[PDB]
Symmetry: C3
Subunit: 366 residues, 3 copies
């Protein structure tokens, strides 16, 4: 059978599965729903949450910290990310394709320095106190959320700050703002931009696979400490419409892919819903949707438009890409004849012959 869209567990449609935590004229912050909820075939993803952030030009996400580690990737645009610690501040500008880990509890803030290009960010979260959920703690005081300092008693805030509660409530609490995302004057932005491990960029190196129809960029834990702690890989691949990414599977990594821009059909061959029968999963992906590719499941992606997609690899270290067709990295073709002769009905010379036909690799026609 072919589980499609609606009843397909791995397809995560944007405007249905995301939950908006905040939204206004300058941006929105929404969280994808829990994975494990939908299927035990994704049990091990329960410790992770996907977060999407949209920010209009010249705006700022007020200071706050969550109780989760954060892998931050910039899908489109450029933002100035700032981390502050009890002993010091640290800022960097991030171009599209850049990433950076945000230790759990690190107060920080973002601003879209640009004057007309929007900011799009994907965030992989890993909660501390509870595997399935995290808590943002906002320092600011706005009509939307309340400052966390406002959670302490007068006696404390008074002693802590040395001042009558009144002087405090005036300066720090109730002339404010209405949301956690506020616009700034270009003068102000220019101010906090003269400062701008540390952020690294996936699309800044020899891609892994490449050809007329598409290129594949990937960065692994082996070559990056921040990535090695999360034990995960970043991956970004763009294909021309009409392209096909040949059926392949990841050795042990579980993949969370998000569609940056473009359209595409995905075919995933996996487990049904303790037998050996295999079921097919299909879905049409579009901008922002999320699709989960379980470890070892064979998958094929078809770009029915010029698209580019980001993928997080959970449980990545020493993961391998096994292509079931084509020349490069084609496990199928490493099986000695005498075996595939018995594997498939046809004769080994015939099966092989069939295999060796498609002289292309990874990114072919359609």
């Amino acid at each position: 059978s072919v589980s499609r869209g609606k009843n397909n567990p791995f397809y995560f449609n944007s405007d249905r599965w995301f939950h908006t935590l905040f939204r206004n004229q300058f941006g929105h912050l929404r969280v994808l729903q829990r994975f494990d909820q939908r299927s035990k075939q994704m049990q091990n993803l329960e410790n992770y949450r996907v977060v999407e952030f949209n920010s209009k030009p010249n705006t700022l996400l007020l200071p706050h910290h969550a109780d989760a580690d954060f892998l931050l990737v910039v899908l489109n645009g450029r933002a100035v990310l700032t981390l502050v610690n009890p002993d010091g501040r640290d800022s960097n500008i991030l171009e599209q394709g850049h990433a950076q880990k945000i230790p759990a509890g690190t107060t920080f803030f973002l601003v879209n320095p640009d004057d007309e290009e929007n900011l799009r960010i994907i965030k992989l979260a890993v909660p501390v106190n509870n595997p399935h959920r995290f808590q943002d703690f906002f320092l600011s005081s706005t009509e939307a959320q309340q400052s966390y300092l406002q959670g302490f008693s007068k006696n404390i805030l008074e002693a802590s700050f040395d001042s009558d509660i009144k002087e405090i409530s005036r300066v720090l609490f109730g002339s404010q703002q209405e949301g956690v995302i506020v616009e700034l004057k270009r003068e102000q932005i220019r101010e906090l931009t003269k400062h701008a491990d540390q952020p690294f960029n996936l699309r800044n190196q020899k891609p892994i696979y490449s050809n007329k129809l598409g290129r594949w960029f990937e960065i692994t834990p082996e070559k990056n400490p921040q990535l090695r702690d999360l034990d995960m890989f970043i991956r970004s691949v763009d294909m021309k419409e009409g392209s096909l990414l040949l059926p392949h599977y990841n050795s042990k990594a579980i993949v969370i892919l998000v569609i940056n821009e473009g359209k595409a059909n995905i075919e995933l061959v996996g487990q049904r819903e303790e037998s050996w029968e295999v079921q097919r999963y299909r879905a049409e992906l579009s901008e922002d949707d999320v699709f989960i590719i379980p470890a070892t499941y064979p998958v094929a992606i078809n770009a029915t438009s010029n698209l580019n997609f980001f993928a997080f690899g959970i449980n990545a270290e020493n993961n391998q890409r096994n292509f079931l067709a084509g020349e490069k990295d084609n496990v199928i073709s490493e099986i000695p004849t005498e075996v595939l002769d018995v594997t498939f009905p046809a004769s080994g010379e015939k099966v092989q012959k069939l295999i060796k036909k498609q002289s292309e690799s990874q990114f072919v026609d359609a």
Copy 2:
């Protein structure tokens, strides 16, 4: 709202939440109840149990082993801890403030060498077979518990020991003792005290924070192997009555604190009971009570008496202390003006000014 005592999830009152496993004229052994039971905000603490031990002078806890690792800390007094292995014995005297890991399965015993000072021990347990519970296996045979050797059949015990079951049952089983804690003659104690990684001491080094009102001692995994395996930190801080430990939060470590001696009010600002509203948690702590401070939650402690408290830091490596007031380690004050100007209603110069007022650090008045 302000969840207080009774309905506050993180407050663990001594005489209600502890479960006594043994008790007599010379001591008691009780276990704190499971954390995760009370709130999903403490899900990740489910793998840990707190154990309290009280021992009158000149007594001994008979030989046994549990199926859990054990972080042993001596709150008050001094005890002689002995570990025995198939290839050898190892003993050390531990003064108050000392700690030492006890590998799971290591048979051991404790004795209070002292002649009039009681022994108080806190124990952080990490079970093996079951995440939530551990099993003590006592070698001794007393009216309280039964020897585990008594669980084997006659045919085995006979072959294993070479002797009729009768000679065995006499020597090893049913002239014995009534409890697992027995008193000894000073002569006997003096005997097992001439022997007395290895035990380390938290209160034996430059404290982290210090002033007229209090000092803070902390030892981290970075600087201690035993601690690095458990990936946790030990911490001990004493404050003068009237003192206040300024609102602060730990970057990623979850903290299990126990009150050694003294009284104190605690204010913890955390999550309610998937929104951004913040709730306040309050409670009055007294000798032996246990309070759990979730990672990243802002907390303030007030010593309404001269107290000293121990704290275990779970998930400690690279954890950071963010103070929301005061001079030292005050994240608030590392945020550039132009930002806190937009963060809080008042002007940046005013907010800042307010911040820079309290010239004290961590331990202030009240």
Copy 3:
């Protein structure tokens, strides 16, 4: 009380607890049932599954890959194991007593080169996507299972392979085979045998314990990378009928033992079904049965026939063997007199005397 066979949780009778996934004239593939299902005393084993494979001479297990790491051990016979990767093939012959890790997702196959000796394999599995279950994905197409390539649409398979779906369905799909285990001509086998970390062997080194009645072979993570990743040990011990393996316990490792050949009675002293009462667990083990020995539980094995058994040690690093009787590795006898004098009713000199009697070690009479 004495929980026996039927109601004993740790006893896993072969023909009742195994589930056959495939079976024919040349072999069978069956999976043991989930551990945690039967008792919370085995909660931490939930991430593991036991797999048994039987293969008649001169046969082959067709190509496939599962979504689980695999510790492969050859109980009896010799098989030629082949791993294929997108960049290359790797084969080795394995004699009885050999082991080797099979990374999750690595396509592979086995063949019994021998001409009259059967192949017996035990497999410890560690699933990726779901802690409790794994998925075999077979490349072949047979009346039993269906090829996973048959899960992709015509448009894909066509583009992926460059050929009308018809030519494909003929060569790769529906002259085939009826099962995943097929027999081969000696000519064929001889073919794939001229190639034959890498496989290591437990029974190829100074045993740990040894004497007239039996020897004990063990290999630990300290001395083997593959083993260090799984953080587990391999162990193989053969005893003469009438022998007794003296009551002992593992410090922190949980042990999954399987009976290769022979008969034996096992006595395990563990927890009942939060008190200190101890219950006894007994059972008669026979060829292929599986018995689980929880960390720190005292156990005694009696060979009521000449047997040999394999054991996997989960959570093995720095694990210790504490013998409660005998000379070598007898914790009991490391306890100083003055203590065992108070531990047991009898006098220390008497208890000790009793202890020092049995001059044998590990493997004694009965």
